[PDB]
Amino acid sequence: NSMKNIESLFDYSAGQFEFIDHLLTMGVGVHFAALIFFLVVSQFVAPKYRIATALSCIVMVSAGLILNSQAVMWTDAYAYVDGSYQLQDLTFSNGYRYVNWMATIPCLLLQLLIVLNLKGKELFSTATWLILAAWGMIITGYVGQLYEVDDIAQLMIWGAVSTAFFVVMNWIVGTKIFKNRATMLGGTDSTITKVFWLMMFAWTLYPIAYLVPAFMNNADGVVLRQLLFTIADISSKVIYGLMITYIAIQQSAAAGYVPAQQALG
Numbered sequence: 001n002s003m004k005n006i007e008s009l010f011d012y013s014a015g016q017f018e019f020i021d022h023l024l025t026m027g028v029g030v031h032f033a034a035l036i037f038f039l040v041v042s043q044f045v046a047p048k049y050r051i052a053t054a055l056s057c058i059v060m061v062s063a064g065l066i067l068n069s070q071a072v073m074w075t076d077a078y079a080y081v082d083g084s085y086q087l088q089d090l091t092f093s094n095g096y097r098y099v100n101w102m103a104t105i106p107c108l109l110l111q112l113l114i115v116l117n118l119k120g121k122e123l124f125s126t127a128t129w130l131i132l133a134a135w136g137m138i139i140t141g142y143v144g145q146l147y148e149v150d151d152i153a154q155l156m157i158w159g160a161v162s163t164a165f166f167v168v169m170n171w172i173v174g175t176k177i178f179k180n181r182a183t184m185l186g187g188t189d190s191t192i193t194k195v196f197w198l199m200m201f202a203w204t205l206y207p208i209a210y211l212v213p214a215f216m217n218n219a220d221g222v223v224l225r226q227l228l229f230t231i232a233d234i235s236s237k238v239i240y241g242l243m244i245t246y247i248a249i250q251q252s253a254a255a256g257y258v259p260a261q262q263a264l265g
């Protein structure tokens, strides 16, 4: 997993290396700061939607820990020798991000179905096919990135299969959204449409980072990839969670829940 990724192939100047480390540690503070927000505001959510904010708290920490682990692993592996940071130990890899995706993605999707006001049979059903679709996407994508150094052909083929799941996944998401927004309260039938387009954008940065080894196989591609993941993380997890929370609170007010009615006031 360490020799299979392109990061183990290049030396990095002090600028490139300190910039990556600063990206990873910044994502930590952003997520753990967001955690405190999602934690505090969960009281302003009616019980019907409160799980939606608790799932954001889980994502914030699941991502913050992996990011924090990525930073420490980033430093342990490289040592400044003769004007450039050089690989010293095989401990860094992007594979740990994919494991973070197996957990955060089901949490990001489940809280979307909760603000849409699904329940019972359809919730457990729609939730089962989206996760198995996301898992199939994450796994096929994990196998392909194991060849981002040896077999680029395999990366493409596995990337194609992973994209097949991605398309099917979003098709189910969009279908459920536009077939259930009329049920949403407080005027959130418009906000949920915006969250969807936020989804379609942020989630599409990952496959672009997945392909950086194919069109920019250099140290500046390693920096571009992490910069892409950083933009994607902050949008698919933080901003996405803020919109989900705003929707959760808004409907809580419309339903007559006072802590949300006084919070928005």
Ligand SMILES: CCCCCCCC/C=C\CCCCCCCC(=O)OC[C@H](O)CO
Pocket: 125, 126, 129, 164, 165, 168, 172
């Ligand atoms: C040889 C390797 C095997 C190739 C196979 C891997 C490719 C999978 C892609 C599409 C089919 C799977 C998706 C089919 C989804 C049908 C179920 C569904 O979508 O229903 C959900 C519903 O909208 C909510 O209740």
Ligand SMILES: CCCCCCCC/C=C\CCCCCCCC(=O)OC[C@H](O)CO
Pocket: 160, 161, 163, 164, 167, 170, 171, 173, 174, 175, 178
């Ligand atoms: C490896 C490449 C394989 C080929 C893949 C490339 C082709 C992509 C085509 C469509 C994307 C669909 C994205 C999902 C967009 C949301 C669709 C939706 O919301 O559902 C329709 C709705 O019911 C209407 O009102």
Ligand SMILES: *C\C=C(C)/C=C/C=C(C)/C=C/C1=C(C)CCCC1(C)C
Pocket: 101, 104, 105, 108, 137, 138, 141, 142, 159, 160, 162, 163, 166, 203, 204, 206, 207, 210, 233, 236, 237
């Ligand atoms: C941290 C949050 C999320 C939603 C991570 C999401 C990742 C993806 C949607 C990755 C998608 C890929 C596809 C479409 C095909 C190439 C390989 C990937 C797994 C990177």
Ligand SMILES: CCCCCCCC/C=C\CCCCCCCC(=O)O
Pocket: 021, 025, 028, 029, 032, 033, 036, 068, 071, 072, 075
């Ligand atoms: C309520 C407080 C909100 C902010 C959360 C706490 C802020 C923590 C700040 C930095 C993250 C700590 C982990 C980064 C490690 C830095 C050293 C390294 O490069 O590995």
Ligand SMILES: CCCCCCCC/C=C\CCCCCCCC(=O)O
Pocket: 047, 048, 051, 110, 123, 124, 127, 128, 131, 132
């Ligand atoms: C591969 C694993 C498939 C998982 C299937 C989906 C499981 C989702 C089950 C529900 C978890 C969230 C429960 C929150 C519901 C809130 C509504 C209520 O309070 O009754």
Ligand SMILES: CCCCCCCC/C=C\CCCCCCCC(=O)O
Pocket: 132, 135, 136, 139, 140, 143
């Ligand atoms: C660690 C928990 C794993 C959970 C797996 C359950 C989800 C399975 C979904 C579809 C898997 C499709 C990927 C094909 C596997 C072959 C790739 C390989 O050889 O490693």
Ligand SMILES: [Cl-]
Pocket: 063, 097, 100, 229, 233
């Ligand atoms: Cl991530």
